[PDB]
Symmetry: C4
Subunit: 299 residues, 4 copies
C-alpha cells in the first residue's frame, strides 16, 4: 500500500511490515535536517521531536498515524524500516537522524548507560560475546520500574558477516504460551537485577489493556529466589528458545527493526567468526507517547 | 548620577546600568582587603560578606541599597560593573575580590561543581565549544530545585578576540512573550536534567510576586516527554533566539555583568577562531538575601 | 548409610557428616551439565537451580531431603561433601558446578562483593593475611540485615600446605554458652559495620524457632559502643577461642564444608609459610529456601 | 596529687591538668598489651576497650574516675597526658596504644576519614598548610549531626620545630563570651558543610545541662546564608582569635592533650619553616560513654 513511503508485509511474517521511504522523501528529509548535526540532537532533546515533525510533514502527516496503528496493533506490532538512498556505513549520521525522527513520532527514547546518550552505537569485530552463542529471546528494560514500550535496532555496517539475523517471537505465535501463562508462577513478582541501580520486582508475564498476555522476561537479569522459581524459569527459557514461531530476520545496512517490546521478544542468532568481520549496530529504547481522545478531569 | 561610584545607562539599553567605582574607592578597597587572599575567601565564606561590607562602607553605605534597588527593579534588573584601575589579567585576584564583594552585598553565591568553589574561572583557547556556535539565551540553575536569582559573568582576560559579546534578553523586550506565556504548555511542569544529581520538574514560565512572567528555561537541560512538548519547545527556542529585543553587550576586561536571572536570559555570541586567542571568564551564581520590613510570627 | 551417595559420621564429630557421591553419579552429573560452562551459571542464575535438579535426579531424589534434614537438624547441621573423581585443581570448574548444584538444592547463594559473582575463588600464596594468625571463629553475614543461613567452603587446590585446617564450633559443644547467653548483653542490639554499605544493629545472640541459642558474631565487624560492651565482647571472644569443643577439620582438595551458619561458628587455623605454598578456596554463602507443609492465607 | 600516676596543674592554666604515668605503670602496661599490635586494635574495636581496662587496672581502678571527673568538670575539662619512658618517635606504636587506652576508658573514638581508622597520624614536612598561618580556634565535629565530646591530639615526633604550640580557649576564660552568646544569632541554626556527606544545621552556641554556654564553631565549615550572618560571624571570629584568655601549650613528643570539645576550643600557632623540619601528630575524636546512677524504664 501511502504519501512518501510504501508498506508491504515481510517474507518472514504478516505480522512484520516493511516500510520504505521514497527516494524523494529521503532527499528532502536530509536537506531539511542538515542544519542539526547528530551532536545537536544529543544535546537538545526537543530537536529529536523536531526532526520527527519534518519527516512526518513530508509524508502528508500520514506517517505518524501509520506507525502508531502498526505498533499498537496486537496482530502486528513490528516494522522493518528503511529509506531509499541511506544504505552505507558512511551515512551513519543520516541513519541516526532517520531512526530518531521515526522513534520520536511515537514516543521518546530513554537514556542509554552504555553510551551516555539517547542512543548507543557499538561495533562487533575480532562468554556473552562468543560468535557461536545465540543471544536468547527477551524483552528490554526488565530491570527498571518504568515499562519499555519499543525497541529499535538499526544495522549501521556489515562486512564479512555470515548469520547474526535478528530473532523475533510474537507471543501469539508462541504455541506454548498458554501453558506457562496459566501457571501460578507466571504472575508471581520475581526479583530482577542489573549488573553494574536498585533491584525491582515484577512478574515475568502481565496483561495488556484487553487482558491478553504480555511479557517482561530476560534470562540474565531475572533472579529466581529458590528451587521452585529457578526450575520453572529454566523450563520457560527452553520453551521460548525452541518455539517454532520464532522469526529469523536479516537486517541489511540502513534498515532498522522497530518493535512493540510488550508482546514481541527479540534476540540475535549466532554468526561465523571471521578475521575481517565488522558489524555496527545502533539501538534506541523508549516509551510510547501519543494523542488519543480520552477522559480528563478539571480544566 | 553617588558616593564612591557613578551610575549611567548603557548604550545598548536603558534597562542595563553601568556602575563604575572611582579610582579612590578602588585603591582603598584593595588596601583594606589585602590581608585576605582569594584562597581565604574560598575557605571561609563569612569573609565573602566581610569584603562586601568593606566595599559598601567605602561608598557611605549607598552601594548595597542601589544594587538591590536596581536588581529587583523589573524595569531594569541588570548591571555592568567595573572599578577604575582593575582592568588587566594580572589583576585577576583583585577582580575576584571585587565581584565577590558586590555579590555578597545582595545575596550569596552557590557552590560551583565545575570548580569546587563558590566561583569558577575558565580559559577559552585553541560541538558546544565551537567558536561559530552561538550559546543560546537561557536561565541558569534550571536543573536544581532552588531558584537562582542572579548570574554574574566577569571578563578576566581577552586577547585576539573578535565577537563573543554577551547576549541578553529582558522578557519585557521580548515581543512574542505573551504568545508563549498564554499557552497551556507555558505552565506545565516539565523534566529538567543535568549531565553528570536527580531530575527536577518545573514549568518553563512562572510569575513573579506581581503575576508578571518569569522564565526558567534552557534548551540543553529541558527534557520534553513527548511530541507535543518537544515541538512547542523548538518553537519557543526559535522565537527567543530570533527576538528583536536581544542586546549584544561587549564585556571588556575587568567588567562584569550582574543580572536578575528570573526575567533576563543570557547567552554568548559566536566569535572568530584565532591561533593566539585567549579569553578568561569568571562566573558566580546565587540567590538574593536582603533585609526588608515584613511580617514575622512569635518573638 | 543412599541412592547415588554414601553418608558417614566424620572422625572429628558425630555432628559433622561426610557425604560422598559415587563415581557413577559424578560421571553422569558432569556429562549432563557439560553444556553449561561455569560462565553460564554466573550469567543465568536459574541455571544454578537446574544443575541442582540434575544432581538430585541422579540420586533418585533422595539428595535434597537428606541435605535439608541434615542442615536443619540442630544435633548435626554440618556436612563435608565430595564426589569421587573430582579431586584436582585442574577440575576447578567441575568443583564449582558441584558445589553450586548442592547449594541450590537447599537455598540460594548471595552475591559476593569480593568477586562480583555468586561465588568467590581466591588464592593464598607468597596483619590479617599472616600465616601464623588464626582466623577466629565467627558467623558470616553479620553486617547486613538479612540472615545468612549457610556457609560453603571448598578446597580447590592445596600445595606445600602445613596446617590451615577449618575450625568449627557447634554452639551445643560450647561449654560456656549458657554463661554468656544469660547475660543481658547477649540480647542487646549492637552496631555491626563492614569495611568498604550502611551499619546494622542486632544482638550477638538470638534464638531459633524453639528458643535455643543461635549466634551472629564476628570480632572484626562488631562495634561496641562503650567500655561495658567492649570488655564483655573481649571476654566472649576469649571464651569462644579457647573452647574445648572446637573441631579441627582438614579439607582435602575437592571437598567442601557446608554448614548451618546460625549454630556453627567457623574459622581457620594458622599454617606454616612456605615459598612454594599454594592454597585455593571457593566460598558461597546464602539463605535456605525449601518446601514445607505450612499455612497460607487467601487463594 | 594517685595509684600509678601523678596529677599537677599546668603552667599555662589551673584548668589544664598534667597527668603522668609512672615508669613502673608504663612498663607493666606495655608488657600486658604486647600481644596486640596496633593493627589488631584497628581491626577489632573491642580491643581498644580492653587495653583501657588493663591500664586502669594497673592504677588500682583510680584512673577512669579521675579522667571522667576532670573532663566533665566545667572548671577544668582538659588534660595533658604522658607516660614515663614513652617519649621518642620510635615508640609511635606504644604511643598509639596508650592514647587508645586512655580514650576508651571515657568513651569511644570515631572513624576518621583521613585515615580510614579510629585514629589518624600525619606528618608535616617540607594556603591551609602555610607555616606562617595560625590554625584558628575551633571545635571538632561541627559538620555531622552527632556531638563530638572530646578531642585527643598527640605529638609523635618533633624535629627542628620552632613554634607550633597548641592553642586552647576555655569558654569561661573568654571575656567577650556573654556579648556574643546573648545575641539572637548565637542560637540561630546555621548551615555547616564539609569539603569532600550532607549538610547539617545547628547554632554556633548551645548550652550544657546546667544552661551554661557551649560552642560548636569552626570558621571553615560554617556557611552564613546572608550578609547579616556573615558579618556577625566575622566579628565572632575576630573576638575569639584576639581573646586574652587563649592558652599557648607546647606538646612535647609522647604527650597528648585530651580536652572537652564542648567548652574548649583548640587551634595551632604558626611555626617557622625549616628544611629539616619534621612534625608527626596523631588525633582521635569521639563521644563520652560512662556509667552513672540515673533513671531507666522497664526491666
Ligand atoms: Fe535486547
Ligand atoms: Fe548561563
Ligand atoms: Fe567466614
Ligand atoms: Fe581540630
Amino acid at each position: 500500500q501511502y504519501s512518501g513511503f510504501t508498506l508491504t508485509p515481510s517474507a518472514q511474517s504478516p505480522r512484520l511490515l516493511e516500510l520504505t521511504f521514497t527516494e524523494q522523501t529521503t532527499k528532502q528529509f536530509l536537506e531539511q535536517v542538515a542544519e542539526w548535526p547528530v551532536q545537536a540532537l544529543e544535546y537538545k532533546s526537543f530537536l529529536r521531536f523536531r526532526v520527527a515533525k519534518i519527516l512526518d510533514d513530508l509524508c502528508a502527516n500520514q506517517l505518524q498515524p501509520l506507525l502508531l496503528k502498526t505498533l499498537l496493533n496486537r496482530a502486528e506490532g513490528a516494522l522493518l524500516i528503511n529509506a531509499v538512498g541511506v544504505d552505507d556505513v558512511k551515512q551513519a549520521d543520516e541513519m541516526v537522524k532517520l531512526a530518531t525522527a521515526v522513534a520520536h513520532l511515537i514516543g521518546r527514547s530513554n537514556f542509554d548507560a552504555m553510551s551516555g546518550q539517547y542512543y548507543a552505537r557499538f561495533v562487533v569485530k575480532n562468554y556473552l560475546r562468543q560468535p557461536h552463542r545465540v543471544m536468547e529471546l527477551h524483552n528490554d528494560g526488565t530491570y527498571v520500574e518504568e515499562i519499555t514500550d519499543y525497541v529499535l535496532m538499526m544495522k549501521i555496517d556489515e562486512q564479512n558477516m555470515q548469520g547474526g539475523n535478528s530473532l523475533l517471537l510474537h507471543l501469539d505465535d508462541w504455541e506454548h504460551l498458554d501453558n506457562y501463562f496459566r501457571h501460578p508462577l507466571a504472575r508471581r513478582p520475581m526479583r530482577f537485577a542489573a549488573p553494574p541501580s536498585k533491584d525491582v520486582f515484577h512478574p515475568v508475564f502481565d496483561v495488556d489493556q484487553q487482558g491478553r498476555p504480555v511479557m517482561r522476561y530476560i534470562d540474565q537479569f531475572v533472579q529466581p529466589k529458590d528451587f521452585e522459581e529457578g526450575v520453572w524459569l529454566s523450563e520457560l527459557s527452553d520453551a521460548i528458545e525452541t518455539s517454532k514461531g520464532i522469526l529469523s530476520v536479516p537486517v541489511p545496512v540502513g534498515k532498522f527493526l522497530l518493535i512493540n517490546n510488550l508482546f514481541w521478544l527479540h534476540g540475535r542468532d549466532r554468526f561465523t567468526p571471521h578475521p575481517d568481520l565488522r558489524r555496527e549496530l545502533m539501538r534506541q529504547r523508549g516509551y510510547f507517547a501519543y494523542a488519543s481522545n480520552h477522559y480528563q478531569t478539571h480544566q
